[PDB]
Amino acid sequence: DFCSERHNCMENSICRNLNDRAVCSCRDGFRALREDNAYCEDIDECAEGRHYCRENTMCVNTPGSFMCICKTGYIRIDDYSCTEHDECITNQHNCDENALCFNTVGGHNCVCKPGYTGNGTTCKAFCKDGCRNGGACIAANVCACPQGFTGPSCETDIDECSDGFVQCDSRANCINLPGWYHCECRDGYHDNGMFSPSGESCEDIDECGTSCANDTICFNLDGGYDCRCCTGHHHH
């Protein structure tokens, strides 16, 4: 510690103990007056022409720093600027629901929150892996899915034949499809109406109209195709 022994530094200078010397330097906010950094004076940030304080402020010089008071009718943006009107008070926002607002000199600025995209006035939810099969991205990394799908990207199909759900019973079979399901008639059944969301549309066909055997009376049945006189068969 050479600075402790000799080579004194003035009160406005910081003594830096060195190995091959004992050098003085000024403190932050002070400017050296002599050749060596012996005695230094505070810099006057409020001097004529200096714009350390920016829009709508009044400068106050302190030893080593400075501060800026807002002009009377103005509200503060930061330590160096103020604006005329708080242009985004709460519940009145000119920005989006999922957006931010900070005051600027001469107005305001709107930016969307993390997980959203847009221009502040309108923000849309962003989904990294995206939504699929017609789903919507309602929140950040959250997809809303149509009735027939599920999964974080609406990529999994709901098995409507195994989820209970539709009891495609009676004269039809449940057949799962990507996004929905079918209710297809069993063997020996035809669809009466145009279609139906269940097995109620399927009807028995006249199962020997315009088969059987060369010599066989033909009878109808709910799913049957009967032939008798020789053959005495009982179909389904």
Binding site: D28, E45, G49, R50, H51, Y52, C53, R54, R76, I77, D78, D79, Y80, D86, L100, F102, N103, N109, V111, C112, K113, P114
Partner: protein, 101 residues
């Protein structure tokens, strides 16, 4: 007789639950000798003012620590020349600090 130009939009690099790293570039038309940079932060949970979190910075990179977990922040940088401070840089994109366990 003019302050320096405004720096470029700062970029967010390292994101923890208590700190954030910033990277900015000086203005292509700086116009006046820059001495240091001033970093300002913004949090909607804190208020509607920009807290000055760093001054006297000499490199174009700085790590703002002492932050709060699970909180949104924004940032901007001012150049500092012989005739005052620059206009603020474009505000950085919003980022949210990580959460604990």
């Amino acid at each position: 007789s003019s302050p320096p130009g405004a720096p470029s939009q700062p970029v967010v690099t390292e994101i923890t639950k208590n700190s954030i790293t910033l990277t900015w570039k000086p203005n292509p038309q700086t116009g006046a000798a820059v001495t240091s940079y001033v970093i300002e932060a913004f949090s909607p949970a804190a208020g509607n003012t920009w807290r000055t979190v760093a001054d006297g910075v000499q490199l174009e990179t700085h790590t703002v620590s002492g932050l709060q977990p699970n909180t949104i922040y924004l940032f901007l940088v001012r150049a500092v020349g012989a005739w005052g401070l620059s206009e603020p840089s474009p505000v950085s994109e919003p980022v949210r600090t990580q959460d604990s366990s």
